[PDB]
Design a protein around this ligand. Structure first.
Ligand SMILES: CNC(=O)c1cc(Oc2ccc(NC(=O)Nc3cc(C(C)(C)C)nn3-c3ccc4ncccc4c3)c(F)c2)ccn1
Ligand code: NA
Ligand code: NA
Length: 275
């Protein structure tokens, strides 16, 4: 009786009218993403849009397709889509405190203390263990792509920031575009990626967390990063970072991807870090 019956049924397709669109999120730097309220469930959501036929549709539908397969407590959750006609919507759960990078930079450090930092990292570890299980390469793992919810809930996401972020975050190396300071050496030289290149990115993220959102490789110019890494230069241990978290960072930044731990081994590392 209540079970679906009609030929064009799609369990992900939602009633546009159920959603009231509020204002743009992330002051423009995160693309066409808005706060919304799913009316009947007294639920605030995030709604990524595509105004009309810009021919950006294929890129948008593919993101939708990806998010439908992804289900984990520390990965952004798809709630529904409006993809039968424009304006196209991707509706996800709303994460109150926005991206992790700005969160860390603006937080009260007595509340977001060293224990909370370690716990946030553990949540990211678990999310990447799951992606590794699904054999999904993130490609742009970083605090700017992590989201923070209530009670220090952290979720890995991807805003497609390489086409949105102005400045010296994403630039050219050997003629290809990278977030240079989060990119594994082999990815810079060969423009290829793997689960182990996300492992390198996770070590940088660890350093971002430990420093409350400092920019990696302080002061070092972008075009200096690769040659520095090749000589075995690695970022120093942040102030107040326990040794075993720092050795995990250093394990993620092994020159050879074969020597980097798996995300499964990274999460075990957090589990056994005491005694
Ligand atoms: C205040 N709070 C807020 O501002 C706020 C905002 C908010 O908005 C959104 C956050 C993320 C997404 N999208 C994704 O997360 N996509 C995703 C994840 C993955 C993984 C699985 C690789 C991580 N791949 N892709 C993904 C896949 C394909 C893509 N193709 C091109 C472009 C990007 C792509 C991303 C979104 F649509 C809306 C949510 C909660 N709070
Ligand atoms: Na830490
Ligand atoms: Na280790």
């Amino acid at each position: 009786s209540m079970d679906p019956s009609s030929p064009n049924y799609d369990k992900w397709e939602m009633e546009r009218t159920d959603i009231t669109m509020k204002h743009k999120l992330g002051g423009g730097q995160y693309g066409e993403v808005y706060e919304g309220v799913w009316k009947k469930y007294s639920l605030t959501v995030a709604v990524k849009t595509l105004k009309e036929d810009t021919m950006e549709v294929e890129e948008f539908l593919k993101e939708a397709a990806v998010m439908k397969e992804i289900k984990h407590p520390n990965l952004v959750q798809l709630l529904g889509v409006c993809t039968r006609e424009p304006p196209f919507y991707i509706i996800t759960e709303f994460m109150t405190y926005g991206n992790l990078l700005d969160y860390l930079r603006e937080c009260n450090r007595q509340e977001v203390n060293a224990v909370v930092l370690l716990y946030m990292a553990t949540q990211i570890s678990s999310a990447m263990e799951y992606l590794e299980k699904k054999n999904f390469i993130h490609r742009d793992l970083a605090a700017r792509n992590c989201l923070v919810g209530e009670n220090h809930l952290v979720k890995v996401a991807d805003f497609g920031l390489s086409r949105l972020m102005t400045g010296d975050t994403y630039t050219a190396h050997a003629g290809a575009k990278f977030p240079i300071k989060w990119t594994a050496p082999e990815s810079l030289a060969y423009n290829k990626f793997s689960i182990k290149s996300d492992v390198w990115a996770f070590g940088v993220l660890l350093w971002e967390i430990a420093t409350y959102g400092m920019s990696p490789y302080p002061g070092i110019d972008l075009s200096q990063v690769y040659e520095l890494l090749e000589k075995d230069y690695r970022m120093e241990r942040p102030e107040g970072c326990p040794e075993k978290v720092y050795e995990l960072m250093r394990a993620c930044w092994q020159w050879n991807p074969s020597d980097r731990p798996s995300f499964a081994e990274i999460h075990q590392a957090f589990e056994t870090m005491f005694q």
